[PDB]
Amino acid sequence: AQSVPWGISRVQAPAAHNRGLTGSGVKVAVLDTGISTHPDLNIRGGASFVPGEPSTQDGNGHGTHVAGTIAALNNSIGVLGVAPSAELYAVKVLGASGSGSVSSIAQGLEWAGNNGMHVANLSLGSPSPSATLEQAVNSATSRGVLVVAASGNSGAGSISYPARYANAMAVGATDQNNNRASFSQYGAGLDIVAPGVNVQSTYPGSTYASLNGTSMATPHVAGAAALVKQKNPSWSNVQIRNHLKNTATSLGSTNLYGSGLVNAEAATR
Ligand SMILES: [Ca+2]
Ligand SMILES: [Ca+2]
């Protein structure tokens, strides 16, 4: 029995699936705690930049969960990703405690750029600016990677790093009423929002779990970006970013919502 998580429907990913767009041939790096083998996931490869964790498997759960929102397989089990044919790469930059260093994150962004990733999902933050982080972001972006990052779960009216840097697409979280989730950070730099409450996805152990956070919102956008790239293979990171905002459903102040709610139907028309 396959279920479709509410968020996947809300961004209207199955309309895009019906048009034949599933993210096929699009390479997506998940910079997180790793990704575990799972019957509803296909991992094409990856790299670890965590000291003394040479494998890319997930000892936390967060990365596996984020990965399934992007690319859970279309079949008779589990859930369904926004872009269920995307090519998933596990880039481990966070440890089991869900924490890492800017050194690790930057090395991951370097690798993504160097290995031709189209999209880099960064469901993570730093509260404090880091030059190393911003140059890493800038670097990946000039190589052609589209960097998507979580705004943060503190509830404040400013957003975390590296989401706050110009070349990273900043994603906040909405609830089932399409309101801003109380924890979702907002303010200057916010680009767009996506479902981030009660998000069911894949979890280590061959199982499924429901989590809340802007970390859960971000992969909806990463997924939607892979659909736009399959339909428009010559488009740049910047064209995709702009088209997602331009086609999003408007929710009110840009301070709070960015351009609004990502809409995969409208972006693949
Ligand atoms: Ca499935
Ligand atoms: Ca930004």
PDB file of N, CA and C in Angstrom, residues 46-133:
ATOM      1  N   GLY A  46      27.384   8.947  -2.939  1.00  0.00           N
ATOM      2  CA  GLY A  46      27.595  10.009  -1.974  1.00  0.00           C
ATOM      3  C   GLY A  46      29.021  10.045  -1.452  1.00  0.00           C
ATOM      4  N   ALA A  47      29.229  10.811  -0.395  1.00  0.00           N
ATOM      5  CA  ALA A  47      30.509  11.068   0.246  1.00  0.00           C
ATOM      6  C   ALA A  47      30.300  11.466   1.705  1.00  0.00           C
ATOM      7  N   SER A  48      31.256  11.139   2.577  1.00  0.00           N
ATOM      8  CA  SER A  48      31.109  11.585   3.957  1.00  0.00           C
ATOM      9  C   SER A  48      32.197  12.574   4.336  1.00  0.00           C
ATOM     10  N   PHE A  49      31.825  13.640   5.035  1.00  0.00           N
ATOM     11  CA  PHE A  49      32.884  14.589   5.388  1.00  0.00           C
ATOM     12  C   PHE A  49      32.919  14.729   6.902  1.00  0.00           C
ATOM     13  N   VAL A  50      32.287  13.745   7.546  1.00  0.00           N
ATOM     14  CA  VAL A  50      32.322  13.671   9.010  1.00  0.00           C
ATOM     15  C   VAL A  50      33.570  12.918   9.464  1.00  0.00           C
ATOM     16  N   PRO A  51      34.365  13.532  10.326  1.00  0.00           N
ATOM     17  CA  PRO A  51      35.569  12.874  10.846  1.00  0.00           C
ATOM     18  C   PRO A  51      35.232  11.527  11.482  1.00  0.00           C
ATOM     19  N   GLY A  52      35.847  10.465  10.975  1.00  0.00           N
ATOM     20  CA  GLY A  52      35.673   9.141  11.512  1.00  0.00           C
ATOM     21  C   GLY A  52      34.365   8.422  11.252  1.00  0.00           C
ATOM     22  N   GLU A  53      33.506   8.916  10.376  1.00  0.00           N
ATOM     23  CA  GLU A  53      32.323   8.281   9.820  1.00  0.00           C
ATOM     24  C   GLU A  53      32.530   8.121   8.311  1.00  0.00           C
ATOM     25  N   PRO A  54      33.256   7.101   7.884  1.00  0.00           N
ATOM     26  CA  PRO A  54      33.523   6.902   6.456  1.00  0.00           C
ATOM     27  C   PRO A  54      32.315   6.430   5.657  1.00  0.00           C
ATOM     28  N   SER A  55      31.248   5.963   6.317  1.00  0.00           N
ATOM     29  CA  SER A  55      30.089   5.517   5.531  1.00  0.00           C
ATOM     30  C   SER A  55      29.097   6.670   5.404  1.00  0.00           C
ATOM     31  N   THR A  56      28.190   6.546   4.437  1.00  0.00           N
ATOM     32  CA  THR A  56      27.167   7.564   4.240  1.00  0.00           C
ATOM     33  C   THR A  56      25.857   7.112   4.866  1.00  0.00           C
ATOM     34  N   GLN A  57      25.832   5.952   5.543  1.00  0.00           N
ATOM     35  CA  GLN A  57      24.529   5.599   6.136  1.00  0.00           C
ATOM     36  C   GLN A  57      24.157   6.573   7.254  1.00  0.00           C
ATOM     37  N   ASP A  58      22.895   6.502   7.650  1.00  0.00           N
ATOM     38  CA  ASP A  58      22.286   7.462   8.561  1.00  0.00           C
ATOM     39  C   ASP A  58      22.172   6.924   9.978  1.00  0.00           C
ATOM     40  N   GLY A  59      22.963   7.480  10.901  1.00  0.00           N
ATOM     41  CA  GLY A  59      22.860   7.021  12.279  1.00  0.00           C
ATOM     42  C   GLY A  59      21.926   7.887  13.108  1.00  0.00           C
ATOM     43  N   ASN A  60      21.215   8.802  12.458  1.00  0.00           N
ATOM     44  CA  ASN A  60      20.319   9.735  13.130  1.00  0.00           C
ATOM     45  C   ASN A  60      18.869   9.496  12.714  1.00  0.00           C
ATOM     46  N   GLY A  61      18.616   9.551  11.407  1.00  0.00           N
ATOM     47  CA  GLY A  61      17.273   9.429  10.864  1.00  0.00           C
ATOM     48  C   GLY A  61      16.886  10.644  10.038  1.00  0.00           C
ATOM     49  N   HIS A  62      17.406  11.812  10.381  1.00  0.00           N
ATOM     50  CA  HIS A  62      16.993  13.070   9.769  1.00  0.00           C
ATOM     51  C   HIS A  62      17.195  13.082   8.260  1.00  0.00           C
ATOM     52  N   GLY A  63      18.354  12.631   7.804  1.00  0.00           N
ATOM     53  CA  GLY A  63      18.721  12.626   6.394  1.00  0.00           C
ATOM     54  C   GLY A  63      17.912  11.668   5.543  1.00  0.00           C
ATOM     55  N   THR A  64      17.696  10.458   6.037  1.00  0.00           N
ATOM     56  CA  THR A  64      16.801   9.481   5.422  1.00  0.00           C
ATOM     57  C   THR A  64      15.391  10.038   5.233  1.00  0.00           C
ATOM     58  N   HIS A  65      14.910  10.773   6.233  1.00  0.00           N
ATOM     59  CA  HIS A  65      13.569  11.341   6.209  1.00  0.00           C
ATOM     60  C   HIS A  65      13.466  12.446   5.165  1.00  0.00           C
ATOM     61  N   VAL A  66      14.437  13.357   5.203  1.00  0.00           N
ATOM     62  CA  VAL A  66      14.557  14.401   4.200  1.00  0.00           C
ATOM     63  C   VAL A  66      14.646  13.786   2.798  1.00  0.00           C
ATOM     64  N   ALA A  67      15.417  12.718   2.632  1.00  0.00           N
ATOM     65  CA  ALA A  67      15.615  12.061   1.335  1.00  0.00           C
ATOM     66  C   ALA A  67      14.321  11.516   0.757  1.00  0.00           C
ATOM     67  N   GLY A  68      13.487  10.931   1.609  1.00  0.00           N
ATOM     68  CA  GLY A  68      12.217  10.385   1.170  1.00  0.00           C
ATOM     69  C   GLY A  68      11.213  11.435   0.738  1.00  0.00           C
ATOM     70  N   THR A  69      11.324  12.647   1.283  1.00  0.00           N
ATOM     71  CA  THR A  69      10.375  13.697   0.873  1.00  0.00           C
ATOM     72  C   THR A  69      10.705  14.092  -0.560  1.00  0.00           C
ATOM     73  N   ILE A  70      11.998  14.063  -0.869  1.00  0.00           N
ATOM     74  CA  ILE A  70      12.466  14.398  -2.192  1.00  0.00           C
ATOM     75  C   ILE A  70      12.177  13.252  -3.169  1.00  0.00           C
ATOM     76  N   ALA A  71      12.485  12.014  -2.800  1.00  0.00           N
ATOM     77  CA  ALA A  71      12.564  10.970  -3.821  1.00  0.00           C
ATOM     78  C   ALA A  71      12.109   9.591  -3.371  1.00  0.00           C
ATOM     79  N   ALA A  72      11.196   9.496  -2.417  1.00  0.00           N
ATOM     80  CA  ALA A  72      10.636   8.187  -2.080  1.00  0.00           C
ATOM     81  C   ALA A  72      10.057   7.587  -3.366  1.00  0.00           C
ATOM     82  N   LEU A  73      10.292   6.307  -3.594  1.00  0.00           N
ATOM     83  CA  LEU A  73       9.972   5.674  -4.866  1.00  0.00           C
ATOM     84  C   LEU A  73       8.483   5.511  -5.115  1.00  0.00           C
ATOM     85  N   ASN A  74       8.119   5.628  -6.393  1.00  0.00           N
ATOM     86  CA  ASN A  74       6.740   5.410  -6.824  1.00  0.00           C
ATOM     87  C   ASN A  74       6.475   3.922  -7.041  1.00  0.00           C
ATOM     88  N   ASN A  75       5.764   3.312  -6.099  1.00  0.00           N
ATOM     89  CA  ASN A  75       5.572   1.863  -6.148  1.00  0.00           C
ATOM     90  C   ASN A  75       4.396   1.451  -5.285  1.00  0.00           C
ATOM     91  N   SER A  76       4.403   0.223  -4.756  1.00  0.00           N
ATOM     92  CA  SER A  76       3.232  -0.206  -3.995  1.00  0.00           C
ATOM     93  C   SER A  76       3.422  -0.129  -2.482  1.00  0.00           C
ATOM     94  N   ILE A  77       4.500   0.516  -2.045  1.00  0.00           N
ATOM     95  CA  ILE A  77       4.784   0.615  -0.615  1.00  0.00           C
ATOM     96  C   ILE A  77       5.126   2.040  -0.202  1.00  0.00           C
ATOM     97  N   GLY A  78       5.113   2.263   1.105  1.00  0.00           N
ATOM     98  CA  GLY A  78       5.584   3.450   1.758  1.00  0.00           C
ATOM     99  C   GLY A  78       4.913   4.745   1.380  1.00  0.00           C
ATOM    100  N   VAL A  79       5.753   5.716   1.018  1.00  0.00           N
ATOM    101  CA  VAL A  79       5.244   7.036   0.654  1.00  0.00           C
ATOM    102  C   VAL A  79       5.666   7.334  -0.778  1.00  0.00           C
ATOM    103  N   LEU A  80       5.577   8.592  -1.165  1.00  0.00           N
ATOM    104  CA  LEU A  80       5.918   9.001  -2.535  1.00  0.00           C
ATOM    105  C   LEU A  80       6.637  10.337  -2.459  1.00  0.00           C
ATOM    106  N   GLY A  81       7.746  10.476  -3.154  1.00  0.00           N
ATOM    107  CA  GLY A  81       8.526  11.694  -3.191  1.00  0.00           C
ATOM    108  C   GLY A  81       7.959  12.694  -4.180  1.00  0.00           C
ATOM    109  N   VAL A  82       8.362  13.954  -4.020  1.00  0.00           N
ATOM    110  CA  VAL A  82       8.015  14.952  -5.015  1.00  0.00           C
ATOM    111  C   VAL A  82       8.593  14.541  -6.369  1.00  0.00           C
ATOM    112  N   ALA A  83       9.820  14.042  -6.358  1.00  0.00           N
ATOM    113  CA  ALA A  83      10.541  13.694  -7.587  1.00  0.00           C
ATOM    114  C   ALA A  83      11.097  12.288  -7.459  1.00  0.00           C
ATOM    115  N   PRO A  84      10.205  11.313  -7.609  1.00  0.00           N
ATOM    116  CA  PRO A  84      10.537   9.926  -7.272  1.00  0.00           C
ATOM    117  C   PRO A  84      11.499   9.243  -8.235  1.00  0.00           C
ATOM    118  N   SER A  85      11.934   9.899  -9.309  1.00  0.00           N
ATOM    119  CA  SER A  85      12.987   9.320 -10.122  1.00  0.00           C
ATOM    120  C   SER A  85      14.287  10.100 -10.000  1.00  0.00           C
ATOM    121  N   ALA A  86      14.324  11.118  -9.150  1.00  0.00           N
ATOM    122  CA  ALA A  86      15.570  11.869  -8.980  1.00  0.00           C
ATOM    123  C   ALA A  86      16.702  10.921  -8.577  1.00  0.00           C
ATOM    124  N   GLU A  87      17.928  11.236  -8.950  1.00  0.00           N
ATOM    125  CA  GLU A  87      19.120  10.483  -8.551  1.00  0.00           C
ATOM    126  C   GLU A  87      19.664  11.088  -7.250  1.00  0.00           C
ATOM    127  N   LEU A  88      19.552  10.311  -6.185  1.00  0.00           N
ATOM    128  CA  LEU A  88      19.873  10.693  -4.825  1.00  0.00           C
ATOM    129  C   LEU A  88      21.314  10.400  -4.424  1.00  0.00           C
ATOM    130  N   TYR A  89      22.001  11.434  -3.946  1.00  0.00           N
ATOM    131  CA  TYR A  89      23.346  11.260  -3.412  1.00  0.00           C
ATOM    132  C   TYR A  89      23.435  11.645  -1.938  1.00  0.00           C
ATOM    133  N   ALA A  90      23.938  10.726  -1.127  1.00  0.00           N
ATOM    134  CA  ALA A  90      24.028  10.996   0.303  1.00  0.00           C
ATOM    135  C   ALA A  90      25.363  11.664   0.614  1.00  0.00           C
ATOM    136  N   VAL A  91      25.334  12.941   0.961  1.00  0.00           N
ATOM    137  CA  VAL A  91      26.528  13.700   1.319  1.00  0.00           C
ATOM    138  C   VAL A  91      26.461  13.955   2.827  1.00  0.00           C
ATOM    139  N   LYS A  92      27.222  13.190   3.598  1.00  0.00           N
ATOM    140  CA  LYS A  92      27.124  13.240   5.055  1.00  0.00           C
ATOM    141  C   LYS A  92      27.961  14.356   5.662  1.00  0.00           C
ATOM    142  N   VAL A  93      27.316  15.393   6.188  1.00  0.00           N
ATOM    143  CA  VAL A  93      28.040  16.544   6.727  1.00  0.00           C
ATOM    144  C   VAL A  93      27.687  16.794   8.186  1.00  0.00           C
ATOM    145  N   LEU A  94      26.714  16.030   8.647  1.00  0.00           N
ATOM    146  CA  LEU A  94      26.299  16.108  10.041  1.00  0.00           C
ATOM    147  C   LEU A  94      26.555  14.763  10.716  1.00  0.00           C
ATOM    148  N   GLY A  95      26.903  14.794  12.001  1.00  0.00           N
ATOM    149  CA  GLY A  95      27.066  13.572  12.777  1.00  0.00           C
ATOM    150  C   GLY A  95      25.736  13.023  13.287  1.00  0.00           C
ATOM    151  N   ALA A  96      25.775  11.866  13.941  1.00  0.00           N
ATOM    152  CA  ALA A  96      24.635  11.206  14.556  1.00  0.00           C
ATOM    153  C   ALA A  96      23.828  12.138  15.447  1.00  0.00           C
ATOM    154  N   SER A  97      24.468  13.138  16.060  1.00  0.00           N
ATOM    155  CA  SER A  97      23.714  14.043  16.923  1.00  0.00           C
ATOM    156  C   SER A  97      22.979  15.108  16.117  1.00  0.00           C
ATOM    157  N   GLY A  98      23.075  15.046  14.789  1.00  0.00           N
ATOM    158  CA  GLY A  98      22.354  15.983  13.936  1.00  0.00           C
ATOM    159  C   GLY A  98      23.101  17.305  13.815  1.00  0.00           C
ATOM    160  N   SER A  99      24.359  17.278  14.256  1.00  0.00           N
ATOM    161  CA  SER A  99      25.196  18.462  14.264  1.00  0.00           C
ATOM    162  C   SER A  99      26.442  18.264  13.413  1.00  0.00           C
ATOM    163  N   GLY A 100      26.961  19.362  12.873  1.00  0.00           N
ATOM    164  CA  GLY A 100      28.236  19.277  12.176  1.00  0.00           C
ATOM    165  C   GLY A 100      29.020  20.567  12.281  1.00  0.00           C
ATOM    166  N   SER A 101      30.104  20.661  11.523  1.00  0.00           N
ATOM    167  CA  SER A 101      30.912  21.876  11.515  1.00  0.00           C
ATOM    168  C   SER A 101      30.794  22.618  10.195  1.00  0.00           C
ATOM    169  N   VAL A 102      31.095  23.922  10.178  1.00  0.00           N
ATOM    170  CA  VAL A 102      31.035  24.589   8.876  1.00  0.00           C
ATOM    171  C   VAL A 102      32.073  23.949   7.956  1.00  0.00           C
ATOM    172  N   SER A 103      33.152  23.442   8.551  1.00  0.00           N
ATOM    173  CA  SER A 103      34.138  22.760   7.732  1.00  0.00           C
ATOM    174  C   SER A 103      33.500  21.620   6.947  1.00  0.00           C
ATOM    175  N   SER A 104      32.686  20.799   7.618  1.00  0.00           N
ATOM    176  CA  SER A 104      32.054  19.658   6.976  1.00  0.00           C
ATOM    177  C   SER A 104      31.034  20.081   5.917  1.00  0.00           C
ATOM    178  N   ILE A 105      30.216  21.054   6.299  1.00  0.00           N
ATOM    179  CA  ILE A 105      29.179  21.536   5.381  1.00  0.00           C
ATOM    180  C   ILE A 105      29.821  22.108   4.134  1.00  0.00           C
ATOM    181  N   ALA A 106      30.871  22.903   4.321  1.00  0.00           N
ATOM    182  CA  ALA A 106      31.533  23.501   3.160  1.00  0.00           C
ATOM    183  C   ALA A 106      32.138  22.436   2.264  1.00  0.00           C
ATOM    184  N   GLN A 107      32.758  21.407   2.839  1.00  0.00           N
ATOM    185  CA  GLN A 107      33.331  20.342   2.016  1.00  0.00           C
ATOM    186  C   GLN A 107      32.266  19.607   1.207  1.00  0.00           C
ATOM    187  N   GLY A 108      31.076  19.445   1.779  1.00  0.00           N
ATOM    188  CA  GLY A 108      29.966  18.835   1.080  1.00  0.00           C
ATOM    189  C   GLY A 108      29.518  19.663  -0.122  1.00  0.00           C
ATOM    190  N   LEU A 109      29.407  20.972   0.065  1.00  0.00           N
ATOM    191  CA  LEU A 109      28.995  21.877  -1.000  1.00  0.00           C
ATOM    192  C   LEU A 109      30.047  21.881  -2.100  1.00  0.00           C
ATOM    193  N   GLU A 110      31.320  21.824  -1.705  1.00  0.00           N
ATOM    194  CA  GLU A 110      32.382  21.728  -2.708  1.00  0.00           C
ATOM    195  C   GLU A 110      32.231  20.460  -3.536  1.00  0.00           C
ATOM    196  N   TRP A 111      32.040  19.323  -2.874  1.00  0.00           N
ATOM    197  CA  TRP A 111      31.883  18.058  -3.582  1.00  0.00           C
ATOM    198  C   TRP A 111      30.679  18.075  -4.522  1.00  0.00           C
ATOM    199  N   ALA A 112      29.553  18.638  -4.071  1.00  0.00           N
ATOM    200  CA  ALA A 112      28.366  18.674  -4.929  1.00  0.00           C
ATOM    201  C   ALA A 112      28.661  19.424  -6.225  1.00  0.00           C
ATOM    202  N   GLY A 113      29.284  20.593  -6.092  1.00  0.00           N
ATOM    203  CA  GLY A 113      29.650  21.391  -7.250  1.00  0.00           C
ATOM    204  C   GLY A 113      30.613  20.626  -8.143  1.00  0.00           C
ATOM    205  N   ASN A 114      31.593  19.975  -7.521  1.00  0.00           N
ATOM    206  CA  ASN A 114      32.590  19.229  -8.272  1.00  0.00           C
ATOM    207  C   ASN A 114      32.027  17.991  -8.937  1.00  0.00           C
ATOM    208  N   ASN A 115      30.959  17.414  -8.385  1.00  0.00           N
ATOM    209  CA  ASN A 115      30.440  16.209  -9.020  1.00  0.00           C
ATOM    210  C   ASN A 115      29.148  16.454  -9.784  1.00  0.00           C
ATOM    211  N   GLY A 116      28.869  17.683 -10.199  1.00  0.00           N
ATOM    212  CA  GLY A 116      27.796  17.949 -11.127  1.00  0.00           C
ATOM    213  C   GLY A 116      26.375  17.817 -10.637  1.00  0.00           C
ATOM    214  N   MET A 117      26.159  17.991  -9.333  1.00  0.00           N
ATOM    215  CA  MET A 117      24.817  17.938  -8.770  1.00  0.00           C
ATOM    216  C   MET A 117      23.988  19.110  -9.273  1.00  0.00           C
ATOM    217  N   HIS A 118      22.705  18.868  -9.556  1.00  0.00           N
ATOM    218  CA  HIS A 118      21.854  19.961 -10.021  1.00  0.00           C
ATOM    219  C   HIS A 118      21.277  20.741  -8.850  1.00  0.00           C
ATOM    220  N   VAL A 119      20.938  19.995  -7.810  1.00  0.00           N
ATOM    221  CA  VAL A 119      20.307  20.526  -6.612  1.00  0.00           C
ATOM    222  C   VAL A 119      21.059  20.033  -5.375  1.00  0.00           C
ATOM    223  N   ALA A 120      21.284  20.919  -4.424  1.00  0.00           N
ATOM    224  CA  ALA A 120      21.834  20.539  -3.116  1.00  0.00           C
ATOM    225  C   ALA A 120      20.812  20.890  -2.031  1.00  0.00           C
ATOM    226  N   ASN A 121      20.299  19.889  -1.317  1.00  0.00           N
ATOM    227  CA  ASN A 121      19.341  20.174  -0.246  1.00  0.00           C
ATOM    228  C   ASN A 121      20.104  20.295   1.081  1.00  0.00           C
ATOM    229  N   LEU A 122      20.013  21.428   1.760  1.00  0.00           N
ATOM    230  CA  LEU A 122      20.670  21.677   3.033  1.00  0.00           C
ATOM    231  C   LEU A 122      19.612  21.845   4.118  1.00  0.00           C
ATOM    232  N   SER A 123      19.092  20.756   4.667  1.00  0.00           N
ATOM    233  CA  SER A 123      18.100  20.862   5.732  1.00  0.00           C
ATOM    234  C   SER A 123      18.830  21.050   7.063  1.00  0.00           C
ATOM    235  N   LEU A 124      19.485  22.182   7.241  1.00  0.00           N
ATOM    236  CA  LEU A 124      20.366  22.431   8.373  1.00  0.00           C
ATOM    237  C   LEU A 124      20.632  23.931   8.501  1.00  0.00           C
ATOM    238  N   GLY A 125      21.239  24.341   9.606  1.00  0.00           N
ATOM    239  CA  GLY A 125      21.622  25.720   9.829  1.00  0.00           C
ATOM    240  C   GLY A 125      22.798  25.890  10.787  1.00  0.00           C
ATOM    241  N   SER A 126      23.268  27.115  10.849  1.00  0.00           N
ATOM    242  CA  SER A 126      24.193  27.780  11.745  1.00  0.00           C
ATOM    243  C   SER A 126      23.585  29.115  12.177  1.00  0.00           C
ATOM    244  N   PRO A 127      23.630  29.495  13.452  1.00  0.00           N
ATOM    245  CA  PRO A 127      22.929  30.723  13.868  1.00  0.00           C
ATOM    246  C   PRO A 127      23.759  31.952  13.505  1.00  0.00           C
ATOM    247  N   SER A 128      25.043  31.677  13.299  1.00  0.00           N
ATOM    248  CA  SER A 128      26.054  32.703  13.103  1.00  0.00           C
ATOM    249  C   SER A 128      26.650  32.669  11.707  1.00  0.00           C
ATOM    250  N   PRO A 129      26.902  33.849  11.153  1.00  0.00           N
ATOM    251  CA  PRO A 129      27.469  33.898   9.806  1.00  0.00           C
ATOM    252  C   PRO A 129      28.835  33.213   9.802  1.00  0.00           C
ATOM    253  N   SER A 130      29.185  32.699   8.632  1.00  0.00           N
ATOM    254  CA  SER A 130      30.481  32.074   8.400  1.00  0.00           C
ATOM    255  C   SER A 130      30.972  32.402   6.992  1.00  0.00           C
ATOM    256  N   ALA A 131      32.112  33.074   6.887  1.00  0.00           N
ATOM    257  CA  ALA A 131      32.641  33.413   5.569  1.00  0.00           C
ATOM    258  C   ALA A 131      32.854  32.146   4.747  1.00  0.00           C
ATOM    259  N   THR A 132      33.305  31.111   5.451  1.00  0.00           N
ATOM    260  CA  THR A 132      33.617  29.852   4.778  1.00  0.00           C
ATOM    261  C   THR A 132      32.344  29.271   4.176  1.00  0.00           C
ATOM    262  N   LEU A 133      31.272  29.361   4.947  1.00  0.00           N
ATOM    263  CA  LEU A 133      29.972  28.909   4.482  1.00  0.00           C
ATOM    264  C   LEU A 133      29.525  29.702   3.258  1.00  0.00           C
TER     265      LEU A 133
END
